[PDB]
A and B are shown apart, each in its own frame.
Chain A
């Protein structure tokens, strides 16, 4: 005996009494939500957001370092012999052992 356990029924919107919809019940709620504001995020976050990502606001010295390096190369080539790296941030250290 189940008494009250049997209550399960198959439910699907599909097309019957909905015409063509995504939201369950009411045609007025469906059009204004599932096609407007659902695709408003598709227009602002994806299309208008594509301008940002990494392009435009430099992004962690990716474009800045190229202009900085080139002027340091031409300066050190004319005067000094060693190119850039020779002794990195070390000038007269107080012994070792």
Chain B
């Protein structure tokens, strides 16, 4: 139903003639994404298994729909790039997205941990080839090696973690079978059992320490801006933290206490740097650290209210940051540099794109209930039940959330553009369509956000 038509996209791009390609890859992907919303949404009290354990049902994952939403969107902004080069090279880097889409569906669907692991690290391989090629600026390798040697250094300890559980306590498999799990006795030998399961997800979900994996991937741009949307998918691709903390270690939260404090300082210091920075893409790269840091806080509290805010923020950030990177790509295709100060001029030269700049920026702040108000505020409300002191630190962060958005606006809202002579056409029909396909799905979530936050909702 989900896999197989996604695999049939591979012979589609190769068999089709050289003049077409892009028409077939975008149109056929849109009708598969419609059918994902058609079937997956149906659930009872406890979400019942789909079929045999190859790809399973969704329990608290409306985040699969987001991957299906970007399934055509990862092709729209990449149209400006790749067109100058060979026809065979075009077909190759569409199929690498199809392979990404193939593995990303498998991660969220399959209710597992053993076979989930060999799909968790499997997403890293197509993205590596994507990042190491087509990079306009240098140091592709000083970002490409850092892309793996941060993730794989933390995720390979899952082999000594997950297998150790199934050898002693039944088997991991279905997760719906996982009620054999007894609470951990909390000892010095049990410390490295908890750390190995966490450190894998501590990298993909960026903190204060070991966070430099993310800005290197964003600043050194893979292809245009459509591949940066797949880098947003990798942040939310480490969703297994929702599953491990609840099932594998329920009694263990004493060792979570130092890791919350690390992520709490990964909110003030990560935001402060995201103010005086030069690169336009970097000012989204560091705001994406703090926005995903909110989720890590929520997971380690383990309260039923926090998971509501956690699941909301995974979808909230997945369509707001990707929206911001498309705006960064739209300036990168015209000015040919990612500098914020040089690329200056909205409304006067970009009349209709400036309204899309406003809607994308304000969504980072707490607007009328779209998704981020259901995302951020739910975590802040849940942190007070943990400790009273939190909102004194969390409130300061709410001031600097404006300082990501408004500083990106103001440093482009000056109608000077004396040095710049380019950017004659404001936006193509596809470029304005990109901006609408990110905000309007969130505007439809205003009416019913039940399919935006659902761990026992």
Residues on A facing B (Cβ under 8 Å): 11-15, 21-24, 26, 29, 32-35, 37-42, 44-46, 48-50, 52-55, 57, 59-62
**B425–A11 touching, CB < 8 Å:** no
**A53–B431 touching, CB < 8 Å:** no
CB of B428 within 8 Å of the partner chain: yes
**A22–B429 touching, CB < 8 Å:** yes
CB of B41 within 8 Å of the partner chain: yes
| CB-based nearest B residue for A37 | B27
Complex Cα distance, B435 from A42, in Å, reads: 12
> Which residues on the B side are within 8 Å of A37 (C-beta)?
23, 26-27, 30
> Which residues on the A side are within 8 Å of B89 (C-beta)?
none
Distance in angstroms from A45 CB to nearest chain B CB is 5
**A29–B19 touching, CB < 8 Å:** yes
Some 10 contacts from A to B, beta carbons below 8 A apart, are A11-B84, A23-B79, A35-B429, A37-B27, A38-B76, A46-B444, A49-B34, A52-B41, A53-B450, A54-B449
Partner of B433, one of A11, A38, A57: A38
> Which residues on the A side are within 8 Å of B185 (C-beta)?
none
Complex Cα distance, B45 from A48, in Å, reads: 27
> Which residues on the A side are within 8 Å of B43 (C-beta)?
59-60
Partner of B451, one of A46, A48, A54: A54
Residues on B facing A (Cβ under 8 Å): 19-20, 22-23, 26-27, 30-31, 33-34, 37-38, 41-45, 47, 72, 76, 79, 83-84, 422, 424-425, 428-431, 433, 436-437, 440-441, 444-445, 447-451, 454, 457
Distance in angstroms from A61 CB to nearest chain B CB is 6
> Which residues on the B side are within 8 Å of A12 (C-beta)?
422, 424
> Which residues on the A side are within 8 Å of B79 (C-beta)?
22-24
User: Which of B33, B47, B431 counts the most A-chain CB atoms under 10 A from its CB?
Assistant: B33
Distance in angstroms from B21 CB to nearest chain A CB is 10
**A44–B27 touching, CB < 8 Å:** no
Complex Cα distance, B440 from A39, in Å, reads: 14
> Which residues on the A side are within 8 Å of B422 (C-beta)?
12
**Contacts A33-B22, A34-B429, A57-B41; A40 near B27 (Cβ below 8 A):** yes
| CB-based nearest A residue for B69 | A45
**B444–A53 touching, CB < 8 Å:** yes
